[PDB]
Write a protein that binds this ligand. Structure first.
Ligand SMILES: [Mg+2]
Ligand SMILES: [Mg+2]
Ligand SMILES: [Mg+2]
Ligand SMILES: [Mg+2]
Ligand SMILES: [Mg+2]
Ligand SMILES: [Mg+2]
Ligand SMILES: [Mg+2]
Ligand SMILES: [Mg+2]
Ligand SMILES: [Mg+2]
Ligand SMILES: [Mg+2]
Ligand SMILES: [Mg+2]
Ligand SMILES: [Mg+2]
Ligand SMILES: [Mg+2]
Ligand SMILES: [Mg+2]
Ligand SMILES: [Mg+2]
Ligand SMILES: [Mg+2]
Ligand SMILES: [Mg+2]
Ligand SMILES: [Mg+2]
Ligand SMILES: [Mg+2]
Ligand SMILES: [Mg+2]
Ligand SMILES: [Mg+2]
Ligand SMILES: [Mg+2]
Ligand SMILES: [Mg+2]
Ligand SMILES: [Mg+2]
Ligand SMILES: [Mg+2]
Ligand SMILES: [Mg+2]
Ligand SMILES: [Mg+2]
Ligand SMILES: [Mg+2]
Ligand SMILES: [Mg+2]
Ligand SMILES: [Mg+2]
Ligand SMILES: [Mg+2]
Ligand SMILES: [Mg+2]
Ligand SMILES: [Mg+2]
Ligand SMILES: [Mg+2]
Ligand SMILES: [Mg+2]
Ligand SMILES: [Mg+2]
Ligand SMILES: [Mg+2]
Ligand SMILES: [Mg+2]
Ligand SMILES: [Mg+2]
Ligand SMILES: [Mg+2]
Ligand SMILES: [Mg+2]
Ligand SMILES: [Mg+2]
Ligand SMILES: [Mg+2]
Ligand SMILES: [Mg+2]
Ligand SMILES: [Mg+2]
Ligand SMILES: [Mg+2]
Ligand SMILES: [Mg+2]
Ligand SMILES: [Mg+2]
Ligand SMILES: [Mg+2]
Ligand SMILES: [Mg+2]
Ligand SMILES: [Mg+2]
Ligand SMILES: [Mg+2]
Ligand SMILES: [Mg+2]
Ligand SMILES: [Mg+2]
Ligand SMILES: [Mg+2]
Ligand SMILES: [Mg+2]
Ligand SMILES: [Mg+2]
Ligand SMILES: [Mg+2]
Ligand SMILES: [Mg+2]
Ligand SMILES: [Mg+2]
Ligand SMILES: [Mg+2]
Ligand SMILES: [Mg+2]
Ligand SMILES: [Mg+2]
Ligand SMILES: [Mg+2]
Ligand SMILES: [Mg+2]
Ligand SMILES: [Mg+2]
Ligand SMILES: [Mg+2]
Ligand SMILES: [Mg+2]
Ligand SMILES: [Mg+2]
Ligand SMILES: [Mg+2]
Ligand SMILES: [Mg+2]
Ligand SMILES: [Mg+2]
Ligand SMILES: [Mg+2]
Ligand SMILES: [Mg+2]
Ligand SMILES: [Mg+2]
Ligand SMILES: [Mg+2]
Ligand SMILES: [Mg+2]
Ligand SMILES: [Mg+2]
Ligand SMILES: [Mg+2]
Ligand SMILES: [Mg+2]
Ligand SMILES: [Mg+2]
Ligand SMILES: [Mg+2]
Ligand SMILES: [Mg+2]
Ligand SMILES: [Mg+2]
Ligand SMILES: [Mg+2]
Ligand SMILES: [Mg+2]
Ligand SMILES: [Mg+2]
Ligand SMILES: [Mg+2]
Ligand SMILES: [Mg+2]
Ligand SMILES: [Mg+2]
Ligand SMILES: [Mg+2]
Ligand SMILES: [Mg+2]
Ligand SMILES: [Mg+2]
Ligand SMILES: [Mg+2]
Ligand SMILES: [Mg+2]
Ligand SMILES: [Mg+2]
Ligand SMILES: [Mg+2]
Ligand SMILES: [Mg+2]
Ligand SMILES: [Mg+2]
Ligand SMILES: [Mg+2]
Ligand SMILES: [Mg+2]
Ligand SMILES: [Mg+2]
Ligand SMILES: [Mg+2]
Ligand SMILES: [Mg+2]
Ligand SMILES: [Mg+2]
Lengths: 221, 203, 121, 116, 48
RNA sequence: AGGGUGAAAAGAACCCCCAUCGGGGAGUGAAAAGAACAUGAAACCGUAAGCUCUCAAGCAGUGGGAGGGGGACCAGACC
RNA sequence: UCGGAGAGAGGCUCGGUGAAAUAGACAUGUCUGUGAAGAUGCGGACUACCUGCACCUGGACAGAAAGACCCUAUGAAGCU
RNA sequence: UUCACAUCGACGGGAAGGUUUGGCACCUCGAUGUCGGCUCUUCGCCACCUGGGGCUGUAGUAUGUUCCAAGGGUUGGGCUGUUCGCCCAUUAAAGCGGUACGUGAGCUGGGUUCAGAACGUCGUGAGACAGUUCGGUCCAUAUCCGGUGUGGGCGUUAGAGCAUUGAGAGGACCUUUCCCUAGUACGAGAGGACCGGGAAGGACGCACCUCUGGUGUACCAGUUAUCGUGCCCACGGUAAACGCUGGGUAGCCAAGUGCGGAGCGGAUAACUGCUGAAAGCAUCUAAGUAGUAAGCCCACCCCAAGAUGAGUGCUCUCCUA
RNA sequence: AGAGAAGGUCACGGCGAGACGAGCCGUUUAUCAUUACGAUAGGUGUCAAGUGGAAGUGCAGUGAUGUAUGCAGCUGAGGCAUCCUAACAGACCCACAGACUUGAAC
């Protein structure tokens, strides 16, 4: 999954409504930022086998960090940071450890982004909620209701299939949301407003990249 | 933490004593190289002449094994893989035993240049199955050889090795590389003998 | 949110008092008539001695819902009843004069119908 | 699930849980310290404090509010008497919770809630 | 649903050992707790 | 349905743990045989010591036996 | 349609007490072939670290004994 | 019309399948049981629609027939115990089969017409009926396999914390109307395009709570009966697990809001092709190569080194006697 | 053998994480003086928000009731402040410079 362009990380602050001059109301997510988005490490095809750049995000007290990690960020000469992440480019010449990213440079207005985040955990969920199973009859004689159904065929094959859909734990995962739009950037509050919903509740941690378009931003294969 | 308390000290000391006395009285190992019928010591031992010889642990020790290299360029897949299997299994040593690994290591290089007769390049079919229904996947030989060409020879030799514990443990002695180069130069590989006539194809 | 078996008030002269929707058209397999969709209804109750007999299959466009229409102003509209207007396959209303309010959301596909309106919303 | 449902259920239905909490507070304000189960204590914090904050203002209105919570009048009047004196400078935080050895019968974790 | 067979001596011995391992973690909590109350410095804890 | 402490109750004083039961000494006794007491098989429940299992497919054994351990006197054997 | 949320009693965890039907022995994969003609156990391939827990019920021709249906018996009884 | 082979194809023949009605009695009789719906799959291709083609008695639109193609789709009702089938209104189309009626230790109707009763009919009669009719009990705490999730142990050759490569595995790559092209080709007219652009929809998937709401036994307000707080006032309890109503934040949720389905990437099936021999002619094929499919494979989206083949990268730590 | 490496588990305060384990965040709560990083939960103060005009005392009315004081009163699962309470006391696991061979370098 080679990624087009450097991304940045941010924090979901919650959603509000935002007008346009002509009275079109757009619901927008407001994505805040914190001190960070500092290039931590750079990986050369020679050295690592591939081309990538590790940006750290959330700053932090030095105590809370572990000695291996602190010693990772003193090799860089950067401030202590909670979350590290990698972006995979096809060319890294522009980047030095300790270099800083600004989201005002990378993202203009009306540009397309891709928001990766972690989803709301809904816990252990039934067949209905998890796979949209139609529920069986509520009344005439029927004892089933929200139950799973039959789970397989008869004597043959005589075992349930792999991956046959069943109740299990739902949510709480890395999820991409493709091709969103950027409505407004506030330099004052350093915030980015985005049309639509992004995963997870406020206080979340997001990763925004310039949108991969399978024809035109990416290696053909 | 390794205790240097007099207790553990004492224990290791004693154990080296036991090991000493057990090494003194036991029969010496005489490796099989121009090894004559018997040493004046074995002659006091158990009967190894009128019973079938079976290898002891000093023999098959992994460090000793021959290494071999097959240039797979213009070789024919199957006919080569047989020879490879023979040598890996050990079937060419007088000391062969089914229950043990007496075999070699084999290094196969230039694994994309391997040659195959007939229309096979476009026909022979490597299938593997997920384990879900409709989990079947098929490759033509050639898609495979463009994508990860080592799998071809690995998969052709694995077929001719025994199956089961000694089989799998054997298969780890087959070291395959797509390039003309291998990083084993330290092991000093000899070249692999081929007594087969038809094994070498010419165009 | 008109769906099959729903009853509807007729908004024009055409001589039906009430419709029962049996289908939704052009929406492919959607089950919801919302404002400005063509539904196939039948006539339950009629106004006597009029060109329209009860138990007729006819086309109508849905002009009023109890569900809520959202324009882009963030503006929202909710009526107190369901109503549709009986039409041709040409987009022209069979009956010639319409009651009640309508919306500017119908101006695109139906000119006639927005023309005859006593009020526009 | 519950996301951000914050209430203490105490494994009882609404009515009972209310009455239980009222009871436990008239107990704490009568005796000044008591022994309960960890959950009951933690749940009871809020209502203890509601009562104290109530008494700090002293209005007839507030006094009728407290009267309609605590069961025993006498404890209420004494509350409105003592509190300005004892707690006047304390902004919040009127209760200490000190845990103990668990119970013998069920091994339910115990606790000591103190009026501090 | 019933047990078509009877459970083999050794497998049962493993399942019951698992259930006995919980005693081990409770023994660690117990030990740590005694070593706490044995310095008399805890104001969060009380014993009579 | 529920029999067999010992020849004799000599049925265990005294101290210790100690709310009782139960126990450990001492004392009785040829023997503790200690009262749920005589020989006390198997299932079944364990504890300790020797070898050994976490890439594995198997009516569980058998023929071959790597490596490790044990009691020997025909130490080339047996377990 | 087309499901949604909530309250109780269970379910779940911890402490106390503590069953049952079942059970040749079980070190108990999938496909396909074979076979008393639908195999964890036979063959060939394929896939599989060891072991819990919560859930689900496709298999084990799952479990609860004579098959009510059909036939047999020079059986049994009731009735005409 | 001429013309057997566009489309039919009589008289006959040669097959495959194992879905109909059957023959057999190898099978199980103890508690291995038939047809429809619900839920939930899955696979076949003899293709109903969607993708590409050849032929036409193909002007165009629309067909007909056939080739490759099973990735995706295949509605809602009135009627039946039903397989079958009929109709209503749609629709791109409303495919046919297999899986023990696929699915009864998942659910439910009939069926094994069990015992009551009645009708027709047969029988002197008790009773009978591959006649009809009304009524009529199936249980279940999952041992193992199989599955969906979620841990521990141990391995990964000193011990760790981070960050990742991606073998393998999955999810999703769907489809309809309308508008430009152009009332242009085509046709005497009536009709009316291929190709390539653009919008709106459907179904499905992934998220979400700003709006519109649902609930919201956290709360707020009215209000009946009644018993408490000495009595008025004002509050408290009860009217199961809200006494009854009217509102509701946070949450969860859809009918609400966003987003998604991209590929002048690779290789093929049918087919159309170029150079061109064996047969000094010809021929898409034998050498070699060109286009080209909703198919196949990469790319997209999650997972993923128990990938024991246990990967690479950065950093940290190994004291004292 | 003493000690307790890096780290882990536990304990303790929690959650937009959760059946349990797991996950994640905290654990003396800074200093500042020019950024951010040292408030986890509860309480308290204030704010968004909800409900819809408290009680008491006045006036009007024969009275039920209305009206003023007053965007009142209650609530505030959400934000922001503030260490007032509880994050006390602590415990356990854990530290053979990494067997053996061969080349290359020096
Ligand atoms: Mg959650
Ligand atoms: Mg349904
Ligand atoms: Mg029910
Ligand atoms: Mg009629
Ligand atoms: Mg007028
Ligand atoms: Mg009540
Ligand atoms: Mg009650
Ligand atoms: Mg509060
Ligand atoms: Mg005694
Ligand atoms: Mg006593
Ligand atoms: Mg005693
Ligand atoms: Mg004695
Ligand atoms: Mg004596
Ligand atoms: Mg005895
Ligand atoms: Mg393996
Ligand atoms: Mg092993
Ligand atoms: Mg095994
Ligand atoms: Mg629910
Ligand atoms: Mg509930
Ligand atoms: Mg009960
Ligand atoms: Mg229990
Ligand atoms: Mg029993
Ligand atoms: Mg096994
Ligand atoms: Mg057969
Ligand atoms: Mg079979
Ligand atoms: Mg088998
Ligand atoms: Mg076997
Ligand atoms: Mg089952
Ligand atoms: Mg069940
Ligand atoms: Mg099976
Ligand atoms: Mg069996
Ligand atoms: Mg006879
Ligand atoms: Mg007879
Ligand atoms: Mg012919
Ligand atoms: Mg027979
Ligand atoms: Mg059975
Ligand atoms: Mg076909
Ligand atoms: Mg077609
Ligand atoms: Mg055609
Ligand atoms: Mg024509
Ligand atoms: Mg298809
Ligand atoms: Mg398919
Ligand atoms: Mg299909
Ligand atoms: Mg239908
Ligand atoms: Mg149509
Ligand atoms: Mg079409
Ligand atoms: Mg089917
Ligand atoms: Mg069916
Ligand atoms: Mg079943
Ligand atoms: Mg019936
Ligand atoms: Mg008669
Ligand atoms: Mg008859
Ligand atoms: Mg009845
Ligand atoms: Mg189990
Ligand atoms: Mg399992
Ligand atoms: Mg696991
Ligand atoms: Mg694990
Ligand atoms: Mg390790
Ligand atoms: Mg480890
Ligand atoms: Mg971290
Ligand atoms: Mg990754
Ligand atoms: Mg891949
Ligand atoms: Mg695997
Ligand atoms: Mg794939
Ligand atoms: Mg595609
Ligand atoms: Mg023209
Ligand atoms: Mg087009
Ligand atoms: Mg679309
Ligand atoms: Mg909302
Ligand atoms: Mg909100
Ligand atoms: Mg409501
Ligand atoms: Mg709400
Ligand atoms: Mg009274
Ligand atoms: Mg009263
Ligand atoms: Mg009341
Ligand atoms: Mg009462
Ligand atoms: Mg009552
Ligand atoms: Mg009620
Ligand atoms: Mg209400
Ligand atoms: Mg939507
Ligand atoms: Mg191509
Ligand atoms: Mg081609
Ligand atoms: Mg041609
Ligand atoms: Mg020529
Ligand atoms: Mg030509
Ligand atoms: Mg060719
Ligand atoms: Mg394609
Ligand atoms: Mg497409
Ligand atoms: Mg690793
Ligand atoms: Mg290895
Ligand atoms: Mg290696
Ligand atoms: Mg340490
Ligand atoms: Mg905790
Ligand atoms: Mg943990
Ligand atoms: Mg501490
Ligand atoms: Mg706080
Ligand atoms: Mg807080
Ligand atoms: Mg007032
Ligand atoms: Mg009130
Ligand atoms: Mg007056
Ligand atoms: Mg307000
Ligand atoms: Mg401060
Ligand atoms: Mg303190
Ligand atoms: Mg070394
Ligand atoms: Mg050495």
């Amino acid at each position: 999954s080679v990624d087009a362009g450097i991304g940045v990380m941010g924090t979901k602050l919650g959603m509000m409504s935002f007008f346009e001059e002509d009275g079109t109301v757009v619901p927008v997510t407001v994505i805040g930022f914190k001190e960070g988005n500092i290039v931590t490490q750079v990986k050369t095809e020679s050295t690592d086998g591939y081309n990538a750049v590790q940006v750290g995000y959330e700053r932090l007290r030095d105590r809370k960090l572990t000695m291996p990690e602190r010693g990772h960020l003193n090799k860089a000469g950067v401030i202590p940071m909670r979350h590290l992440q990698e972006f995979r480019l096809v060319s890294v010449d522009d980047f030095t450890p300790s270099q800083k990213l600004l989201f005002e440079e990378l993202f203009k207005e009306g540009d397309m982004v891709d928001i990766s985040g972690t989803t709301i955990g809904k816990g252990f969920q039934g067949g209905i909620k998890r796979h949209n199973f139609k529920r069986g009859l509520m009344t005439h004689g029927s004892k089933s209701h929200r139950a799973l159904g039959s789970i397989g065929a008869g004597t043959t094959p005589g075992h349930v299939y792999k991956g046959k859909k069943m109740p299990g734990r739902m949510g709480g995962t890395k999820t991409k949301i493709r091709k969103l739009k950027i409505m407004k950037i506030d330099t004052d509050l350093r915030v980015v407003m985005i049309k639509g919903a992004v995963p997870g509740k406020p206080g979340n941690l997001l990763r925004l990249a310039p949108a991969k378009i399978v024809g035109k931003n990416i290696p053909k294969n | 933490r390794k205790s240097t308390s007099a207790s553990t000290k004492c224990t290791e000391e004693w154990r080296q004593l036991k090991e000493a006395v057990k090494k003194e009285f036991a029969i010496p190992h005489v490796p099989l190289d121009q090894r004559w019928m018997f040493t004046l010591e074995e002659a006091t031992g158990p009967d190894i002449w009128n019973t079938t010889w079976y290898p002891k642990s000093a023999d098959h020790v992994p460090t000793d094994k021959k290494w071999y290299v097959v240039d797979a360029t213009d070789l024919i897949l199957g006919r080569m893989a047989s020879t490879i299997a023979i040598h890996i299994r050990g079937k060419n040593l007088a000391s062969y035993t089914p229950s043990v690994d007496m075999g070699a290591f084999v290094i196969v290089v230039n694994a994309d240049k391997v040659a195959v007769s007939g229309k096979k390049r476009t026909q022979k079919l490597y299938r593997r199955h997920s384990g879900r229904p409709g989990g079947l996947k098929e490759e033509t030989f050639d898609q495979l050889q463009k994508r990860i060409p080592e799998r071809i020879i690995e998969h052709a030799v694995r077929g001719m090795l025994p199956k089961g514990r000694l089989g799998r443990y054997l298969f780890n002695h087959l070291k395959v590389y797509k390039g003309a180069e291998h990083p084993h130069q330290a092991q000093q590989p000899i070249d692999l003998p081929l007594r087969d006539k038809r094994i070498r194809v010419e165009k | 949110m008109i769906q099959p078996q729903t009853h509807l008030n007729v908004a024009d002269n055409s001589g039906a008092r009430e419709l029962m929707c049996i289908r939704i058209i052009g929406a492919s397999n959607r089950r919801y008539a919302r404002i400005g969709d063509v539904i196939v209804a039948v006539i339950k109750e009629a106004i006597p001695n009029t060109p329209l007999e009860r138990s007729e299959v006819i086309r109508a466009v849905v002009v009023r819902t109890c569900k809520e229409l959202k324009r882009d102003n963030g503006m929202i509209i909710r009526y107190d009843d369901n109503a549709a207007v009986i039409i041709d396959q040409e987009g022209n209303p069979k009956g010639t004069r319409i009651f009640g309010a309508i919306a500017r959301e119908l101006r695109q596909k139906f000119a006639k119908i927005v023309s005859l309106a006593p009020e526009v919303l | 699930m519950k996301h951000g449902r914050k209430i203490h259920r105490l494994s009882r239905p609404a009515d009972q849980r209310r009455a239980l909490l009222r009871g436990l507070t008239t107990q704490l304000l009568k005796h000044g310290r008591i022994k309960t189960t960890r959950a009951k204590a933690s749940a009871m914090r809020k209502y203890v404090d509601k009562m104290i904050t109530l008494a700090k203002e002293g209005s007839l209105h507030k006094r009728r509010q407290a009267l309609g919570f605590i069961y025993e009048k006498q404890i209420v009047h004494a509350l409105f008497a003592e509190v300005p004196e004892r707690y006047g400078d304390r902004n919040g935080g009127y209760t200490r919770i000190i845990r103990t050895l668990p119970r013998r019968g069920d091994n339910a974790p115990m606790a000591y809630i103190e009026l501090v | 649903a019933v047990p078509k067979k009877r459970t083999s001596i050794y497998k049962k011995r493993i399942r019951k050992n698992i259930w006995k391992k919980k005693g081990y973690w409770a023994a660690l909590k117990a030990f740590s707790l005694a070593k706490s109350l044995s310095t008399g410095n805890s104001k969060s804890f009380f014993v009579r």
